[PDB]
Each structure stands twice: as C-alpha cells, then as structure tokens.
Design a protein around this ligand. Structure first.
Ligand SMILES: CC(=O)N[C@@H]1[C@H](O[C@H]2[C@@H](O)[C@@H](CO)O[C@H](O)[C@@H]2NC(C)=O)O[C@H](C(=O)O)[C@@H](O[C@H]2O[C@H](CO)[C@H](O)[C@H](O)[C@H]2NC(C)=O)[C@@H]1NC(C)=O
Ligand SMILES: CC(=O)N[C@@H]1[C@H](NC(C)=O)[C@H](O)O[C@H](C(=O)O)[C@H]1OC(C)=O
Ligand SMILES: CC(=O)N[C@@H]1[C@H](NC(C)=O)[C@H](O)O[C@H](C(=O)O)[C@H]1OC(C)=O
Lengths: 671, 210
C-alpha cells in the first residue's frame, strides 16, 4: 500500500551514480542519513564499503512530497552491520529526523516498513510504499523478521529503508531493511512466496548526539552532529573528526583493542580498557545527573544537571563560514561611490586563503557606514559561522544586525537581532566581543561599556534559537577611577577549557608594563572577578597587540602577543595556557615568529586568527598593505609545539581592485 | 673566572649574536673539552626550524672567552624535541664527546653516542651508534634526573640516574662504559620510598642545565 502524502517524510530515496543503483534510507540527523551498506559496496549486496567519498556520485530525495534533493559527501560504514552513515553536503530543513529506539525489539512486535523500493506491481514507484512486519527473534546484531501477512514483502531497491516502531503518536527507528527472499515482489519468480527477512538492529548502537549517564559507546560506533563526528575506533582510540575528514581531538588510547568509552553516573566521560576495569583516559569531571553532548556548533561538551558546562574538548573551527571544516575570513568593503558589500576568503587545504567572493552587494544610501563595529561567530547554532554588525544611528539609537552564513560561503541579508531606543546605549562607549559566553552552543555578544562618568560594566547579550538576541544584562562592574578604557586591550577565548568563552585584558600598568587579567564566564553568561594570569615588565604595552586562540591543540585557548620593536623588526611571543598546582595561568613566553627589520609594518596590516588548514591547531593570517599598494594574504600555520611555520602566500591584488584602508574584517575582538 | 681565593672575578663578554639569530628557546647546551686542548667549551644542540638537530661547538679562547661556533654534527633522522644531550669522555680518549638520550614515540628510549675525532685536520663528531636501549615503558625520560661522571674511576665517563618509579620509589642506576663506548647493563644502587626522598622536591648539582 502507498503512504499518504506528508507521511514518513524522514524516509529518503537514494540515487547512486548515473541511475546505476537504487537504495533507500532514513533521516537520522539534520545533516546525516542512515542507509544500507550493501548498496554502497563494490559488489552489490555483499562485501565491504569504502570509507570516505562514495565510489559514485550519489544524491538523496526526501521530505513530505520528496521535493528536497541533497548530495551525500562522506560515508562511514559499520563492520558488524549492514549499516552506513552518510554525511550530507547540507542539512535538511523542514524534515524531522527519526530518533533511535531506546529499548530492545522483541518477538511479536510489529514494525512499520517504509521505502522507495519496487512494489508488487510497480518496478520503480514514484511514491513511498509500506509493509507490516512482525519480529520473530532478536540476536547478535540483526533481527529475524517476517510478514504480519502473506500479502506484502520487502523488495529489492527498498534496502536501507527504515523499520519504525510507533510510540506516543510518533515513531522510533529500530532497523534498516537489508536482505530477503522477496516473495510476491515485482520481477521476482512467483515460485518464491516467502517474505522472511533479516535486518541489522539499530537499537544496540550509539545514536543522536548525547550520552546519558550509564551510556556505553562501543568500538566502531559514533555520535553525529552538523559540524562534527565523535567516534570510537576499533583500535580503542576515541576521536573527534571534522567535515574535512581530519581529526581535531583524540585521547590517544590507540592499540588498546576492545577498549570502550562510557559516560559514568559520576558525570565524567572516560575510556576503559578491554577488562572493563582499567581507565585509559578521563575528563576527570564531576557532574551527577549530567550528560555529554556533541553540539552542532562543533565541539563536544560535558554538561551538569543544571545545564552548565564542566568540560569541553574544544574541537571547533572558528568562523568556518561554509562548514567545510576549515576557518575562513570575511570583510566589509566600503566603496568610494557609497555602496558596500561583504567579501569572503575561504580557507584552502594547505592553509592558504583563496580569492574572495562577494555577497550581499547593496546600493549606495542603504547603509550609513560611519559608526559601526563588526563581529563574527555562530549565532544560530548552525554549525557554520555567521556575522553581525553593531551600529549607531544619527538619532543616537542602536541596532545589532545579524547575517547568517550560507553553504556557498556567502552571507544572507542582515536582519535586526536586537535594538534599543536612543538614550540607552551609545556606539562610542560600546566595545563588543563575540564568543560563546553562556555555553549554550550558540555564540553571543559581550560588551565592555565605558561610561562617561568613568565607571565600567560588562553587558551580555545571550542568543535565542530564533537567531535573535535577548536583552542585555550586567554582571561584573568597576567604580570610576579604577579601570581606564584607554588602557584596555581585550581578547576573548576559552582559556581554561570549561566550555565557556571568556575575556582577558592586557592592561597598561602606568609605566607601560603589561598585566594580563582573565574574566571567567559564569554559568549564567555573566563574568566573574578577574585574576592575573600573566605579567611582564620586559615589553612595552604600547607596542603589544594581543591575539587569542588554541595554538597547540590543548583544547584550551591561549594568547600570543605581536610586538613591534624599535628596531623595525617584529615578533610573536606565545604564552600557552597551563594549570600548575591547581592554579590557572599562562606559561613562559617564547618567540614563535620573527621577521627581518622593515619586512612587515604592524600598522599596515590587518590580523585575524583561526584554524585555516583544519588540523585542530589555531593559526593566524593577515592582509598586509605593501609599499607599492599591493595587498597580499599570508598564513602562518602552527606546529605541534606552538612554533609557527613560514608564511604561505595566498590571494593578492593591486590597489586598483582592493583598497586596504577601505575594508574592515569581521573579527571576534576589536583591533 | 676563578681566583685563588675561591672567589669569582667580574664577568666579561666575548661571543655575541644579534637579535633574530640565535633563539634561546631552541638551545640545548652541554659543556666539556671536545678537542682535548685543556680548556672546556660549549656545544649547542639547536632545533633547526623543522625540529632537526644541528650541533655547534664554541671553542674556548686562551683568555676564557668563546670563539665563533662551528658545526660538528647534524642529523635530520631524529626529532629535536625528543633529544636530551649529555657530554663526557665515553671511551677514554682524553677528549670529551656527546651522547643523546632519545625518547621514541614507541615508549622506548635509547642513547646514541657520537665520539669525538679529527679527520683530515677537521674536528667533528663521528657517526652515531646506539650504546644503550630499553624496552618500551621501561623508563620514562620525564620521571628521572641524569648526571654523568666517572663513577668507578676506570678513566671512562659514564652516566647514572635517579628515576621515579610508578609506585613512588626512587632508585639509582649506573651504566658503566666499555672500551668501545658501549654501555653495560644498569647496576642498582641506593633506593628509597617516597616517604623518605621526594623526587620532585630535589635538584641535583650539574655541570649544565637540564
Ligand atoms: C566628536 C566626538 O568626540 N564624537 C564621539 C565619537 O568619537 C570617536 C568614536 O566614534 C570612536 C569609536 O567609534 O571613533 C573615533 O575615535 C571618534 N573620534 C572622532 C574624532 O571622530 O564618535 C561618535 C560617533 O557616534 O562617531 C560620536 O557620536 C556622534 O555620532 C553618532 C553616529 O553618527 C551620531 O551621529 C550622534 O548623534 C553623534 N553623537 C552626538 C552626541 O553628537 C561621539 N560623540 C560624543 C558626543 O561623544
Ligand atoms: C613581506 C613579505 O613579502 N614577506 C615574506 C614572508 N615573510 C613575512 C614576514 O611575511 C615569507 O618569507 C619571505 C622571504 O623573506 O622569502 C618574505 O618576503 C620578502 C620579500 O622578504
Ligand atoms: C626500571 C628498571 O627497574 N630497570 C632495570 C634496568 N634497566 C633499565 C633500563 O633501567 C636493568 O635491567 C632490568 C631488567 O629488565 O632485569 C630492568 O628492570 C625491569 C624491572 O624491567
């Protein structure tokens, strides 16, 4: 029988190659499908499936009227089941994924079989058809299934189709169709009347993006999200990989075959050996009643019962605009004719930056670009970076604009995410910072507001699931005569790896010495009393330009200082974050980059950090204005020891095309 | 320099380098008399960008200062970040030479000895050979302190360590040197529980840092 339109929208049809093979599957996550492995095998119906890109260009069609078409990019097959998870080029909107069953199937249970395979009469139906199956037995990694009646059957081309169990008006995923006698099916000898079938069980595997207390993640298993995958390898090594196919984080527990990863009732996440007793790795957290969740934003975070982050792996790519697993950068370009547009430079596989593409090109008079500040970050929880603009208006009012990132690397039209009547906030006093301060899986905005009376307050604008911002609230504050705005150079990042971004300030201490404060983020998104993590009198504050990022892949961010020497030369000193004797601080500074005198002018180039080659370690790239007016991109990648490599040249242009002083890059912290 | 009163004179400089040349963070230094001229001098195992190892020697001037360095040994087969150089006369030549303790990714470690020699009038270190090796997991290079010297007084320098064991016990080991600069098996010496000697709370008097 045919399925009523709008039903089982989560059920997808797959087309492999140039109509070479037919296969079915089900939506499991916004950007993931679950399909049969046998249809992607070199030998159809049996044998191994290649990991990574499929052997043939493959697409899938799904939705209530099968009106949505998406491409499958990457396969990660399982070895003990006819099951492969396929990553999509883009997430599917408007279609709800099917959750995994949390209980075992049992004999006598009725399962609903739906797919796009051949029917009793139709070789290649244009709609979904279903069948009623009953469980006969459950063992190993498969189910023994038969028909509820002798009228229907599972037929060729329907492989990979979901077998659903109805519960509370909804459905749960129990198994995918695999092999059968296909009795009574079109194109099959009528002599065969059996509809007995065997399918892999999907109830005894990890799924979704969360681990509950007591949950166990078996080897050759994984959790998935839009911008990351968490998997435990057969060799016992628990790893997280990006959409680029590269590993961002690992426990390093390789060679311990049979090792298992589990989330304990104590709230910690650990890796245990084959003996079920010996611990090979632990997050060493405490959070009873908590859970471990792999976010769409990118990273893996362990949260307590109150929803507060306790620990994070830090497996994220900052301002990745297309979601391809590598950091990008973008700029707001003001043309001399009054019009403006946003240009995006995508990261390449070698860490270089490709030629920019433009988007959101608007006419003169649309924006009054005299008093605006630019922010970047993922403000929707998409898994791809967005942008935002904080702008003042001639009536003294303020608005905060947000533009969502597109899959093609461009941006959509900005929309107002927050606004205030004049007399509330003033653009001249606000100093916004982007990052995830709340730890809710969406970036938000913090403002260091300097009052005319000399007082200071930190305001936080948390993000909603609508992409909009809530009303600002204050937390940390200081009396007038204490903190001076003119002496504050601020950066942001997650400096202790607690899953929440926070502030740090390089303060000019009277004699132009440098003292670094950190302002840890509260569970409520606010900020706590600062403490000093680093200080030095060996360097002049007026010549320091601090930057933040994870420059050794620790999972916790740290800082470097670009220093402009009187000699005409410059260098970067990196201070890695570490905890010693229970005390958090930055370690001793070392020179990681240096140039000859006169080789670079710090006032003629714009800086932006990020993970450009997607190797899990943050690095920095610049657009520098050369003596002849030429603008050139350089990227210095980070070595495992936080030493930088030589700069790699990327896109460049004459001043006749790109004017240096007329463009501003979207950043995470000002200057 | 030292006086006959046991006191030191005012310091004076000799060799120097401009900024942007030698980076302190990439310098692992040892000292000894590497050409047998009767004066001790410096040598540096420098991390050459890609973490390869290049060894410089800084011969001592008659006035106690140091002269322009020259390269005595280089190899790209070993990772600088895993090398801990030591100096001494490990074959009784009368002129000091160096060995490198190497911490492998495999969990094992070894010592490679490069004996000092003069060939065609040119001073350099000879080809490296493995003189000591251990099973994987047998020793942790970050849990033990090293010190070289001639412990049995046979004229050939050798090395001994105080290693911190998994159970907190601290144990002394000495590996004596054979005439061919091969090491013998380690000989156990004094040992104690952590309740008596705390490993991380004691520092040995050395001739060169780390
Ligand atoms: C003249 C002056 O002091 N203007 C104030 C402020 O000056 C700074 C500041 O904008 C920073 C950061 O944006 O950039 C430069 O350092 C500016 N310096 C100079 C010399 O221009 O600029 C703001 C501003 O919004 O540019 C002024 O506020 C005014 O402009 C806004 C936006 O266009 C709007 O037009 C307001 O009506 C106008 N505000 C007032 C009160 O006249 C700052 N003004 C004051 C009075 O503090
Ligand atoms: C400015 C520029 O072109 N820099 C190049 C870059 N270094 C930095 C510091 O950015 C690399 O090394 C080049 C080289 O030294 O080959 C530099 O080029 C030149 C021409 O000196
Ligand atoms: C650490 C330790 O006790 N080392 C002993 C030492 N070797 C090294 C490399 O120091 C000798 O040979 C012993 C053996 O192998 O008899 C080692 O003991 C054990 C117990 O393996």
């Amino acid at each position: 029988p045919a399925v009523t339109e709008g039903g089982h929208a989560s059920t997808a049809r797959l087309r492999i190659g140039d109509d070479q093979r037919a296969c079915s599957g089900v939506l499991v996550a916004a950007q993931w499908l679950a399909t049969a492995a046998s249809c992607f095998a070199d030998d159809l119906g049996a044998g191994p499936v290649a990991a990574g890109k499929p052997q043939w260009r493959t697409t899938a069609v799904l939705g209530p009227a099968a009106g949505t078409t998406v491409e499958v990019v990457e396969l990660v097959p399982r070895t003990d089941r006819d099951l492969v998870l396929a990553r999509l080029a883009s997430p599917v909107a408007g279609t709800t994924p099917v959750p995994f069953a949390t209980t075992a199937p049992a004999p006598g249970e009725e399962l609903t079989v739906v797919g796009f395979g051949r029917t009793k009469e139709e070789w290649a139906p244009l709609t979904r058809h279903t069948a009623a199956f009953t469980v006969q037995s459950v063992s190993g990694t498969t189910l023994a299934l038969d028909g509820r009646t002798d009228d229907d059957a599972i037929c060729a081309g329907d492989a990979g189709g979901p077998l659903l169990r109805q519960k509370d008006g909804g459905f749960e995923l129990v198994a995918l169709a695999s092999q059968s006698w296909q009795g009574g099916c079109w194109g099959t000898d009528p002599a065969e009347t059996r509809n007995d079938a065997v399918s892999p069980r999907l109830d005894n595997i990890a799924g979704g993006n969360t681990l509950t207390p007591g949950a166990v993640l078996r080897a050759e298993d994984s959790l998935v999200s839009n911008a990351a995958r968490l998997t435990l390898r057969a060799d016992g090594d628990l790893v997280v990989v990006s959409n680029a196919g590269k590993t961002l984080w690992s426990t390093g527990t390789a060679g311990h075959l049979g090792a298992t990863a589990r989330f304990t009732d104590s709230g910690n996440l650990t890796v245990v050996d084959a003996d079920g007793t010996t611990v090979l790795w632990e997050s060493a957290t405490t959070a009873p009643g908590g859970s471990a969740v792999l976010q769409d934003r990118g990273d893996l975070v362990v949260r307590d019962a109150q929803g507060a982050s306790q620990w994070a792996a830090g497996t994220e790519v900052r301002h990745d605009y297309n979601g391809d697993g590598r950091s990008d950068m973008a700029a707001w370009y003001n043309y001399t004719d009054g019009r403006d547009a946003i240009h995006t430079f995508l990261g390449g596989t070698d860490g270089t930056l490709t030629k920019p593409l433009k988007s959101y090109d608007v006419a003169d008079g649309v924006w009054d670009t005299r008093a605006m500040k630019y922010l970047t970050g993922d403000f929707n929880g998409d898994g791809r970076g967005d942008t935002a603009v904080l702008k003042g208006y001639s009536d003294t009012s303020v608005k905060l604009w947000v533009a969502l990132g597109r899959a093609d690397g461009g941006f959509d039209a900005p929309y107002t995410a927050w606004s205030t009547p004049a007399g509330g906030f003033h653009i001249s006093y606000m100093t916004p910072h982007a990052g995830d301060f709340n730890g809710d899986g969406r970036d938000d905005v913090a403002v260091w507001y300097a009052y005319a009376d000399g007082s200071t307050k930190l305001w936080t604008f948390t993000s909603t699931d609508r992409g909009t911002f809530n009303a600002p609230f204050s937390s940390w504050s200081a009396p007038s005569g204490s903190w001076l705005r003119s002496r504050v150079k601020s950066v942001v990042g997650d400096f202790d790896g607690d899953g929440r971004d926070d502030l740090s300030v390089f303060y000019g201490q009277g004699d132009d010495t440098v003292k670094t404060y950190v302002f840890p983020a509260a569970p409520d998104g606010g900020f706590t009393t600062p403490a000093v993590w680093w200080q030095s009198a060996s360097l002049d504050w007026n010549r320091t330009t601090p930057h933040a990022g994870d420059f050794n892949g620790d999972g916790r961010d740290d800082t470097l200082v670009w220093y402009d020497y009187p000699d005409g030369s410059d260098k970067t000193s990196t201070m890695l974050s570490e905890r010693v004797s229970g005390k958090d601080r930055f370690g001793s500074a070392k020179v990681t980059l240096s140039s000859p005198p006169g080789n670079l002018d710090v006032t003629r180039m714009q800086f932006l950090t990020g993970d450009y080659d997607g190797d899990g370690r943050d690095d920095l790239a610049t657009l520098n204005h050369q003596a002849d007016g030429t603008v050139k991109m350089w990227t210095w990648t980070a070595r495992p020891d936080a030493m930088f490599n030589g700069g790699i040249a990327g896109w460049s242009a004459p001043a006749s095309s790109w004017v240096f002083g007329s463009a501003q890059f979207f950043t995470t912290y000002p200057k």
